[PDB]
């Protein structure tokens, strides 16, 4: 476990709910790329890495192996489903708050299991869909996950934002508030 | 809350002393429980849970898989690391330092890569040992970080407080001072 | 090109 640099080639995921699947490659924690099983194309989260090529066909077949393997383990474990853990939610800015200058709001949702979540940005009872982006479910040492949701905005005196997190490991939805102060 | 059955495959690679120490560990998980794993140091699939045992016995039965998995240290870990040496291991982002105040004094070190950093608090050329509280290293996701180091103090006229920050991208530490 | 590692089937 003790090392200078660690990488996952790759982070394979498949779940009964949906059914959903995810294929990623991570280095030192951060995500290098994700393969879209729908459109059958590789999408890099870093521009310096775009230079290389990764054929999507591998992720497509590997996820089909995990489809059989998950179906095999349900019969073996006499139907034992995942335990819904408590997701930790925290909302903070990327850079120091400047009313004029632009900024990126970050809603970090940690300790996610199973990887099924609904992250929503709220501003004055209205939902925000413009200027939003989400990272894929990122792996953890405790075999749980963490997801990051971004929001590009220009701070204002009357503008206030909130992050609604919906999970099966919550009795009520979690909401974290933010103000430019 | 409906029933969810989750299966994960984490074909991980570990690295130390550059290219001198490489350890391949590929593990299969169900649900949040690691059932079976393959360490490069052992050279065979070894079950962690009773659920891992029927797969491990079957995969160790086939000699062809053993040779391909033993090759994965060079075929996966050692090969992909050479690509990292030119891209991710070349990425360097200089941090931005801002002190916000008073009884409390916080040093907001934002946007930097790699994760290695050493931030210190000084009270008039003298390093403060106690009364320092630091938040854990915050991963921003977009290959950038941030660390919030707070320092409790007492106010006096003519006393300057400095935030000393060390990072590989920086050739010399940043001299950001706050006058009182 | 980045070379990955595959998962084997369960019996």
């Amino acid at each position: 476990i003790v090392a200078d640099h660690v990488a996952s080639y790759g982070v394979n995921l498949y779940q009964s709910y949906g059914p959903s699947g995810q294929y990623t490659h991570e280095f030192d924690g951060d995500e290098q790329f994700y393969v879209d099983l729908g459109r059958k194309e590789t999408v890099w989260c870093l521009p310096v890495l775009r230079q290389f090529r990764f054929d999507p066909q591998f992720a497509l077949t590997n996820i089909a192996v995990l489809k059989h393997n998950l179906n095999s383990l349900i019969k073996r474990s006499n139907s034992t489903a995942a335990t819904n853990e408590v997701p930790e939610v925290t909302v903070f800015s990327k850079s120091p708050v400047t009313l004029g200058q632009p900024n990126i709001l970050i809603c970090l949702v940690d300790n996610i299991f199973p990887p099924v979540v609904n992250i929503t940005w709220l501003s004055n009872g209205h939902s925000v869909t413009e200027g939003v982006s989400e990272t894929s479910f990122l792996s953890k040492s405790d075999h749980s996950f963490f997801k990051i949701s971004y929001l590009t905005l220009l701070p204002s005196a009357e503008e206030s934002y909130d992050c609604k997190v919906e999970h099966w490991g919550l009795d009520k939805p979690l909401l974290k508030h933010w103000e430019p102060e | 809350s409906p029933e969810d059955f989750v299966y994960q495959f984490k074909g991980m690679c570990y690295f130390t002393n550059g290219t001198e120490r490489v350890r391949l560990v590929s593990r299969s998980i169900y649900n949040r429980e690691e059932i079976v794993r393959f360490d490069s140091d052992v050279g065979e699939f070894r079950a962690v849970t009773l659920l891992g045992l029927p797969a491990a016995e079957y995969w160790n039965s086939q000699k062809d898989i053993l040779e391909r998995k033993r090759a994965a240290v060079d075929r996966v870990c050692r090969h992909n690391y050479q690509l990292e040496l030119r891209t991710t291991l070349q990425r360097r982002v200089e941090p931005t330092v801002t002190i916000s105040p008073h009884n409390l004094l916080v040093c907001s070190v934002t946007d930097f890569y790699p994760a290695q950093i050493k931030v210190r608090w000084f009270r008039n050329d003298q390093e403060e040992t106690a009364g320092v509280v630091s938040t854990p290293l915050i991963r921003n996701g977009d290959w950038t970080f941030q660390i919030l180091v707070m320092l409790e103090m007492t106010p006096q006229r003519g006393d300057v407080y400095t935030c000393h920050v060390e990072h590989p991208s920086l050739q010399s530490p940043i001299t950001v001072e706050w006058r009182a | 090109q980045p070379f990955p590692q595959p998962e084997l089937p369960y019996p």
């Epitope: 066909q57 591998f58 077949t61 | 090759a71 | 090109q1 070379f3």
Partner: T-cell receptor
Framework: MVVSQHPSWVICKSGTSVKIECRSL??????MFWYRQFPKQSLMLMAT?????????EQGVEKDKFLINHASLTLSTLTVTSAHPEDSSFYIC???????????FGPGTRLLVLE | KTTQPISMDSYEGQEVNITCSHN???????ITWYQQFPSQGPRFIIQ???TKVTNEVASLFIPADRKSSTLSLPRVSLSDTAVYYC????????????????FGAGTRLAVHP
Amino acid sequence: MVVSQHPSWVICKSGTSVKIECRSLDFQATTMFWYRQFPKQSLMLMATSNEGSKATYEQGVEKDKFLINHASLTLSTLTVTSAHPEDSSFYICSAGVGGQETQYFGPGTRLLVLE
Amino acid sequence: KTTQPISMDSYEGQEVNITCSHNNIATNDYITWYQQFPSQGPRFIIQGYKTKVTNEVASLFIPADRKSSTLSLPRVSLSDTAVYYCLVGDGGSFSGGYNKLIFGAGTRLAVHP
């Protein structure tokens, strides 16, 4: 790892469609392939398939004539629509765990098309 | 892709060593061998990467430069009369990579009493 192929021997008229079945017997075929060998020549890959879909045919050979239905983790059948004396060849299928490196070949089907 | 002998004729209980020539081999490539009997599907004998492999059927030898490889059969029996195919590649897109396994001419071996 053992792979079977039915029928073993086949003889038909020109226009008749032939269903060559590829089955995995002591494992579950992740990837199933198809190969074509002529009188005194080497093996040539026709296509690659995965459950449920879909075929990844190679080159210079149409998919109108050759139909592959890899549904099931052990079954994959090849259909030769409107048979022609040119098609008279030896057909072998592969199965892996998966990929071409892990492949295990079937016994083979000898096709003979006549006027 | 690869070049191996056209044909070999040996006596019973003799060590047969077929040499495969692959100078243009890529770093992440496998050396795979198939035994085809007339007229049936080929049999997977041995496979390797950089190190020496040992099977109940045969043994694979790979030197440091990887420019060539040699398949050694212990005591050839009358039943070992077959076509031995040598193949280089990572298994193609489904494994995944550029180097897809393509069947060469193969060495026609014949064993005699």
